Amino acid sequence: SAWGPAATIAARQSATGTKTDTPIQKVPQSISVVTAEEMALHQPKSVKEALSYTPGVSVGTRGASNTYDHLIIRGFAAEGQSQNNYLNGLKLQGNFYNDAVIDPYMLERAEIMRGPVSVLYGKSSPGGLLNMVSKRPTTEPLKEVQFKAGTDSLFQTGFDFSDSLDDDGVYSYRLTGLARSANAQQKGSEEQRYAIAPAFTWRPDDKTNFTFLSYFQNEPETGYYGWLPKEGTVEPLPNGKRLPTDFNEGAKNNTYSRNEKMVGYSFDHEFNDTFTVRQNLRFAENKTSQNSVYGYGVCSDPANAYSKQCAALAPADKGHYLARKYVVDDEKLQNFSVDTQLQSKFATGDIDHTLLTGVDFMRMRNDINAWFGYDDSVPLLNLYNPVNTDFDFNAKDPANSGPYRILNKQKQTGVYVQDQAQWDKVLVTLGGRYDWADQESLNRVAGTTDKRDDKQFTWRGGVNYLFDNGVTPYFSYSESFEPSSQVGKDGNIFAPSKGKQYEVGVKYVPEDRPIVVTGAVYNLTKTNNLMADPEGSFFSVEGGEIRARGVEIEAKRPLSASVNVVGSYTYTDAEYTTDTTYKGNTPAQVPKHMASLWADYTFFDGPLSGLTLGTGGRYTGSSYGDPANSFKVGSYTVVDALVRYDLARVGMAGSNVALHVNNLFDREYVASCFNTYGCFWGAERQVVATATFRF
Ligand SMILES: CCCCCCCC[S@@](=O)CCO
Ligand SMILES: CCCCCCCC[S@@](=O)CCO
Ligand SMILES: CCCCCCCC[S@@](=O)CCO
Ligand SMILES: CCCCCCCC[S@@](=O)CCO
Ligand SMILES: CCCCCCCC[S@@](=O)CCO
Ligand SMILES: CCCCCCCC[S@@](=O)CCO
Numbered sequence: 140s141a142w143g144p145a146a147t148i149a150a151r152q153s154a155t156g157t158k159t160d161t162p163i164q165k166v167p168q169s170i171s172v173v174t175a176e177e178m179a180l181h182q183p184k185s186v187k188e189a190l191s192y193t194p195g196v197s198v199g200t201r202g203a204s205n206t207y208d209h210l211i212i213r214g215f216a217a218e219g220q221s222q223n224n225y226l227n228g229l230k231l232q233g234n235f236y237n238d239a240v241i242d243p244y245m246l247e248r249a250e251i252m253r254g255p256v257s258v259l260y261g262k263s264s265p266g267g268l269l270n271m272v273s274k275r276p277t278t279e280p281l282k283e284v285q286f287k288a289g290t291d292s293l294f295q296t297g298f299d300f301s302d303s304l305d306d307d308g309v310y311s312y313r314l315t316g317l318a319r320s321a322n323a324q325q326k327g328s329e330e331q332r333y334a335i336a337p338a339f340t341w342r343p344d345d346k347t348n349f350t351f352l353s354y355f356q357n358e359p360e361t362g363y364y365g366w367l368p369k370e371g372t373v374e375p376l377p378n379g380k381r382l383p384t385d386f387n388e389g390a391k392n393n394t395y396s397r398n399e400k401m402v403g404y405s406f407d408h409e410f411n412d413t414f415t416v417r418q419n420l421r422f423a424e425n426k427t428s429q430n431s432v433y434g435y436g437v438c439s440d441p442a443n444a445y446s447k448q449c450a451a452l453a454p455a456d457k458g459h460y461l462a463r464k465y466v467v468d469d470e471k472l473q474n475f476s477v478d479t480q481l482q483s484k485f486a487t488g489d490i491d492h493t494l495l496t497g498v499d500f501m502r503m504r505n506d507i508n509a510w511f512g513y514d515d516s517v518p519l520l521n522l523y524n525p526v527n528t529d530f531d532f533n534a535k536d537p538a539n540s541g542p543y544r545i546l547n548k549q550k551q552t553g554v555y556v557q558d559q560a561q562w563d564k565v566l567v568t569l570g571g572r573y574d575w576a577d578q579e580s581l582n583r584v585a586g587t588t589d590k591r592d593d594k595q596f597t598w599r600g601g602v603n604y605l606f607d608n609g610v611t612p613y614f615s616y617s618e619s620f621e622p623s624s625q626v627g628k629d630g631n632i633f634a635p636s637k638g639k640q641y642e643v644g645v646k647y648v649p650e651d652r653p654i655v656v657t658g659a660v661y662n663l664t665k666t667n668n669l670m671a672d673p674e675g676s677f678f679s680v681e682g683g684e685i686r687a688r689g690v691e692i693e694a695k696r697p698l699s700a701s702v703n704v705v706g707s708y709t710y711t712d713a714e715y716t717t718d719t720t721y722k723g724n725t726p727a728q729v730p731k732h733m734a735s736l737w738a739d740y741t742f743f744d745g746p747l748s749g750l751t752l753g754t755g756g757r758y759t760g761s762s763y764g765d766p767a768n769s770f771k772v773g774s775y776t777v778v779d780a781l782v783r784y785d786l787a788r789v790g791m792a793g794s795n796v797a798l799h800v801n802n803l804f805d806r807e808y809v810a811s812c813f814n815t816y817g818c819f820w821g822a823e824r825q826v827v828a829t830a831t832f833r834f
């Protein structure tokens with residue numbers, strides 16, 4: 140069965156770590172890759188769930204909401220809470236609410252880097268980054284139709300077609316699209332999605348490959364994305380009861396939509412056995428909008444001390460009345476990116492070289508036209524007896540609401556060089572990069588204009604030792620930088636923050652046995668983090684520092700043609716080593732322990748031939764609900780099951796029917812809280828039937 144050897148053999152190749160084709164063992168950093176075969180098996184609903192059984196990442200911190208693919212890697216999120224995802228070696232640079240998403244059914248691969256890597260990609264988050272590989276045209280025909288149906292009125296249909304147009308394979312293509320409709324977990328919310336992905340590959344000769352990659356997506360409704368207070372979730376309400384799992388605190392007429400257009404290409408050319416040129420470019424237009432009413436903690440939460448509405452309440456009702464605000468947003472993002480690389484392979488005695496040098500630049504501009512409601516901008520919500528009604532998003536009086544109209548421009552140009560020198564069984568990775576990062580923000584209401592031009596240099600070095608049995612010990616050191624976007628007291632944009640990581644580990648990748656096992660220890664630390672000013676000024680200050688260190692181990696292997704086992708364990712110790720206020724505490728939403736195990740069996744011989752069965756468990760240890768560590772969030776364990784049946788029997792090979800069940804024991808838990816007034820219920824049990832037919 141396709142996914143057996145895929146998760147353990149194919150999953151051995153990668154490029155997100157070095158930009159050149161390099162096997163996992165020769166990469167001096169922690170890198171995980173999930174194949175499409177695996178994704179086909181699990182049917183993840185997003186890219187997040189596709190990383191479930193990999194170490195060092197929290198894929199479900201935002202609970203049931205699926206609006207964004209936000210990932211917290213090694214206890215770190217990106218600047219401005221924005222995503223940190225790349226599509227085909229190029230970053231889907233977003234801004235404010237404008238963040239693009241790619242359905243997993245359009246992906247071929249998903250590789251995830253852990254730790255710093257600005258060495259190859261410019262400004263990045265300390266924790267790491269995700270890189271999704273689009274499906275490319277197969278030179279072997281593919282004609283597939285798929286039908287989905289399940290819990291919450293989930294209805295989906297999709298197709299994936301690929302074939303050759305010429306007779307020799309000079310022109311091939313791939314067209315894959317889907318249409319999905321479903322109700323959100325929260326009452327009154329729904330999600331609709333429509334995507335089509337046209338790809339065309341032109342191969343002039345055996346040394347040239349030009350592949351056109353386009354993607355279009357329209358989402359009338361993106362679903363729920365609100366805030367619920369801990370009182371009614373983590374903690375029982377004053378009447379001992381807890382808000383229901385599907386509770387919704389937003390207006391009956393809440394709306395949230397997203398539209399995405401992308402055009403670009405990937406080009407390869409090999410001159411000799413010594414030189415190879417490579418270029419990647421994409422142009423993207425993103426549009427997002429929303430009319431949202433969201434919770435902002437109960438009336439007794441110290442966060443609403445200035446709410447006239449809360450105040451005009453008997454201080455007993457104060458603990459079961461939720462305050463609320465709203466936001467009206469509308470953004471338009473334009474993004475241009477090109478990365479050109481020259482790859483040189485040569486020798487020097489007994490030393491084989493693989494030199495990489497490239498120029499990488501990107502230009503984006505986001506046009507925000509929003510309107511936010513402050514305190515008392517929307518009628519309280521009685522948690523004991525909630526009443527969902529419409530909200531007038533237009534009637535906007537300056538008494539409780541003001542505009543927010545910004546035009547953000549970002550820019551980054553970088554030059555980088557890297558060598559992969561190898562002597563016998565020793566491998567040394569050495570590389571550096573220099574970045575020119577300019578940014579400017581124009582506030583249209585105030586007429587002001589803030590800008591800053593950063594210059595940063597980063598590098599990475601590491602050693603890999605290739606024992607002949609598969610054991611490949613290694614160690615490395617890499618840096619990262621992330622410019623700031625917030626303004627200081629002096630009316631300037633703060634200085635960039637930095638990431639420095641040391642890591643030692645081992646990778647077992649035997650050529651003869653189909654297994655992959657990993658273990659690694661690290662000390663990542665983020666410097667120049669923004670912290671509270673040691674003064675009542677509502678402004679912030681630099682010089683902060685957070686430090687994270689831990690152990691991650693991952694295991695993948697087919698104990699037989701019928702059994703496969705995948706799992707991981709993650710111990711992460713993150714902490715504020717120097718912050719004017721939360722010093723000593725551990726960042727919120729970061730658990731110390733994380734474990735996951737999945738296994739599946741398939742009957743080849745017998746009456747149940749072609750039948751597959753799988754189960755898996757992802758354990759999430761406890762975590763702090765706020766940076767003050769004033770309350771915790773209970774650990775939880777979720778179990779998933781699977782039932783698949785090859786249809787070769789009935790007459791159709793390649794095709795199959797499946798039944799997936801997530802959160803089998805329908806456990807009710809809160810995924811996390813980033814504060815007392817910001818918690819999220821986890822996802823209730825879901826059952827989905829999937830028919831995938833191949834002609
Ligand atoms: C085949 C599944 C996709 C069809 C979409 C039908 C319309 C969904 S929405 O327009 C109304 C939901 O009640
Ligand atoms: C092949 C599946 C196509 C089904 C989608 C039909 C249109 C739904 S949406 O485009 C308009 C809803 O009012
Ligand atoms: C059959 C699935 C639909 C494919 C996507 C078609 C384009 C949607 S968006 O590009 C324009 C919306 O008006
Ligand atoms: C400018 C600071 C941003 C404040 C956040 C306001 C609420 C947005 S989110 O909490 C709900 C979106 O529907
Ligand atoms: C050779 C034995 C045939 C058993 C197939 C029974 C029906 C399963 S499939 O045909 C429909 C699933 O919903
Ligand atoms: C779009 C509506 C069609 C839904 C078909 C879902 C699969 C049917 S079979 O695979 C399982 C039957 O229980």
Ligand SMILES: CCCCCCCC[S@@](=O)CCO
Pocket residue numbers: 282284834
């Ligand atoms: C959704 C329509 C699928 C088109 C495939 C039609 C049959 C082609 S192949 O199945 C046999 C060729 O001889």
